[PDB]
Amino acid sequence: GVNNMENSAALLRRLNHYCARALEGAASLCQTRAHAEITPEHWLLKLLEQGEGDLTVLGRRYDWDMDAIWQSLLGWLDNQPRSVRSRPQLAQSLNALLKQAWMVASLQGEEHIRSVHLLGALTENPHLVRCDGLWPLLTLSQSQLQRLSPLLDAQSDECPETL
Ligand SMILES: [Br-]
């Protein structure tokens, strides 16, 4: 009903501008391919496409083979079957990832969701993705991600706008 609808909408409003822009990009990509559901893989592809956020900073720091991650996401994208819809919806796994990322962020005292929170949610629930090439994203624990906040705040485009 109404309360559930408004809860899902409040969750979308909590996304920072980087993550929101990427989610819109994922929805646009789904529309061009006439796919019914926006998955976390569609979102991760668009996050990496923007390539200046928390994920890119971590990839650079920990020397992830970013090309192999991108190729795995392309492979996953091309292997997805068409599922007729004039307009896409968020997949069950995406609503779950969004909700868990907010819970990760809110437990840290944050008001907004950034890509590191989506990563934190993913590392604690690896089955939210069904793409083998995403294994580097599962290498850091939530405790490690939390400790990396000063580095992310110095290098990511998702950092605070003030000191
Ligand atoms: Br990124």
From TrEMBL:
The chain holds residues 1 to 159 of 885 of the full protein. This is Type VI secretion protein. Belongs to the ClpA/ClpB family. It comes from Escherichia coli O44:H18 (strain 042 / EAEC). It comes from the Bacteria. Residues 12-163 form the Clp R domain.
